[PDB]
């Protein structure tokens, strides 16, 4: 495929921030598994994988949600799968899940565990990483941002559009999902959510972005 | 129709986090322009686009930061090009950066950027985006990765490989790109690091992710 570079630029043009979805047309069972997948396969600092990808389909959850997340309102109402995306809390190499990743998961050889914990630690704070809790957090939310952006693109390949959504009330929302069990705050916080479904009509506006020049600079020859 | 699922996936299992590429293969100008552009195309949070894409080929500017990048010393040695993404600082709607956003890029209606403002404002104080500066650098700095993700899973489908580096002393790599006027640190921040090439040979080791129930769960029906 030599036109593969058409085929990916008209992927990134047909990606819009959708809020209103046709009600009608649902994503198929393999479609969402194919988004799902460049989520659960997207890189990640340390290969640390510090995310939850729940799909919320119940609709009075849904509901719920809406009252409290004002720029999702809509994409809640009609999107044909709709996905929050967690971020893990306290990622350090003290933790429980870095060392289940460590040991279980990345395979890591046992004896060289506890210099690579080292390593990790002095990472952390080379990058400030661990400066304070919220540093900590926002670093694996991060991580999360690659997962978002995988997913959206990974949609619009397959012709369906998408939505990533921060508008919403994360106290509140946080807290309703809290209680309802699904949201553990003490290992996970509420990252970003992300909507998918097929339009109900082209975008009536252009999309916009700076100027080339005025976002990309080569430093040194340029060919 | 449902060619484009395997070779998503395929795209998806190409990448990895090479660390030597091969120094006499060269990515062609047409595949990193479609690369740079899905960057530049990129969705951000309200549209602000808070990044910057520079593009490091002088092979001595590469040497002086790789002295204080260890995570990317290889690739700053082998990659055909290396890019160093920025994120804006102080993205708020009082900020000269985003009045040019709404007036001359997004061309918002002038009489009524008050209340664009101010639903700016709420919003980033709903998601304690303005808690402080760190949050605020860090929100911007969350959406350079959605373009980070759409620039590897890009070059990925291109048959190029890439990869992300965190690995390198913030404060350091700062002052060096500061001291040479690459990097305005009032404006911007050094956010994350991205390389791209083709790899010297196949990764040794197999692709390692959670299991698909361990990061996924689905609220209501599946299918
Ligand atoms: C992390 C993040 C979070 C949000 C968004 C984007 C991103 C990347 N944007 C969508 C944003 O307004 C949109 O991407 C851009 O303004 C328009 O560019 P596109 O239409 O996507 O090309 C968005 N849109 C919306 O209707 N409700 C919302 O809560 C948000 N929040
Ligand atoms: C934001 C970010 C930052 C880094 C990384 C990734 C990401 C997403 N990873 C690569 C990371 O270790 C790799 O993606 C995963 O651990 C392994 O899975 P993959 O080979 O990519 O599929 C990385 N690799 C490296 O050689 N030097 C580095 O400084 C970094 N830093």
New binding site residues.
């Given amino acids: 495929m030599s036109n593969m570079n058409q085929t990916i630029m008209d992927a990134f043009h047909f ?3 959708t ?1 209103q979805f046709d009600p009608q047309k649902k994503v198929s069972k393999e479609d969402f598994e194919t988004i799902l997948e460049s989520g659960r396969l997207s890189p990640s600092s340390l290969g640390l994988e510090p995310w939850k990808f729940v799909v919320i389909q119940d609709q009075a959850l849904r509901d719920e949600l809406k009252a409290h997340s004002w ?2 309102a809509k994409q809640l109402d009609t999107a044909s799968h709709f996905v929050l995306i967690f971020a893990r809390k306290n990622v350090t190499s003290r933790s429980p899940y870095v060392q289940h990743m460590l040991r279980d998961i990345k395979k890591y050889e046992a004896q060289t565990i506890p210099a690579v914990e080292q390593k990790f630690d002095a990472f952390q704070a080379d990058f400030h990483i661990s400066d304070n809790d919220q540093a900590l957090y926002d670093w694996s939310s991060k991580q999360t ?1 690659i997962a978002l952006g995988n997913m959206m693109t990974t949609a619009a390949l397959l012709g369906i559009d998408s ?5 919403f009330s994360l106290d509140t929302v946080t807290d309703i999902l809290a209680n309802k069990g699904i949201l553990d705050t003490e290992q996970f916080g509420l990252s ?1 959510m992300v909507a998918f479904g097929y339009r109900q009509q082209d975008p009536p506006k252009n ?1 916009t972005r700076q100027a080339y020049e005025d976002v990309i600079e080569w430093v040194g020859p340029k060919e």
Same sequence: chains 1, 2.
């Fill in positions: 990606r819009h921030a809020k720029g999702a941002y939505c990533p959504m921060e508008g970003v999309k």
